[PDB]
Amino acid sequence: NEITAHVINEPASLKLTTISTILHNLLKPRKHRLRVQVVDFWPKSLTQFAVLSQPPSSYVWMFALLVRDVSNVTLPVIFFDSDAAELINSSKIQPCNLADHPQMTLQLKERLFLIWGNLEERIQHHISKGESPTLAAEDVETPWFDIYVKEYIPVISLTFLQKRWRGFGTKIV
Amino acid sequence: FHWKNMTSLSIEECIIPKGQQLILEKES
């Protein structure tokens, strides 16, 4: 599990735990560190990686990476707004209507290639073939990198299904 | 596990409440 030179993390004192530990004494906000591989993502079109926040045309980054740890368990990690900008780490790649920006979409693809390798290609391959996108993960080797996540419960009883995780302090280089 | 975020995702879910944000910010 040798991490890519292509992903740098912010200076932090958090130590390495596992996704198994995260899921298995109260439910307050937590801050974890993981050594991880991307196994899936949402949404399936990179064209939809930025959404409209404020009309008429103000967009923000919003997507999720399904990540997998040494302990063979997955976690959906949300990259939103400034944290997603941190990851993308590119002046020329900005939130907008991506369908209207083919060149920038290609640039996004190329940048995200550095964190998930041929995952996107394979996911799209399966969609066109009429097969499940989850097949893609086992087709390819995706790179390893350290990731920071902030655990929290947004306002949408109160169970674990109600927790969300958000990536941060992680940049593609 | 079949996670919700792998089918649907909204801006609601991405917003960290101000109180929880403060806890994370201080511990940093």
Residue numbers in the entry:
A (entry chain A): 372 to 395, 400 to 531, 539 to 555
B (entry chain B): 185 to 212
What do the study's own words say?
The conserved shelterin complex caps chromosome ends to protect telomeres and regulate telomere replication. In fission yeast Schizosaccharomyces pombe, shelterin consists of telomeric single- and double-stranded DNA-binding modules Pot1-Tpz1 and Taz1-Rap1 connected by Poz1, and a specific component Ccq1. Here, we report the crystal structures of Pot1DBD-single-stranded-DNA, Pot1372-555-Tpz1185-212 and Tpz1425-470-Ccq1123-439 complexes and propose an integrated model depicting the assembly mechanism of the shelterin complex at telomeres. Overall, our findings provide valuable structural information regarding interactions within fission yeast shelterin complex at 3’ ss telomeric overhang.
The crystal structure reveals that Pot1372-555 adopts a typical OB-fold architecture containing a highly curved five-stranded β-barrel, hereafter referred to as Pot1OB3. The formation of the binary complex buries a total of ~1,200 Å2 solvent exposed surface area at the interface. The N-terminal 310 helix H1 of Tpz1PIM and its peripheral residues fit into a hydrophobic depression formed by strands β1, β2 and β3 of Pot1OB3. The short H2 helix fits into a narrow cleft formed by a two-stranded β1’- β2 protrusion and the long loop between strands β4 and β5 of Pot1OB3, with the sidechain of Cys198 pointing into the deep hydrophobic groove. In contrast to helices H1 and H2, helix H3 and its peripheral residues are away from the major binding groove of Pot1OB3, attaching to a rather flat surface of Pot1OB3 formed by strands β1, β4, and β5 through both electrostatic and hydrophobic contacts. Consistent with the crystal structure, single amino-acid substitution of Pot1-Leu441, Pot1-pro451, Pot1-Ile453 or Tpz1-Leu193 at the H1-binding interface, or Tpz1-Cys198, Tpz1-Ile200 or Tpz1-Pro201 at the H2-binding interface with positively charged arginine residue completely abolished the interaction between Pot1OB3 and Tpz1PIM.
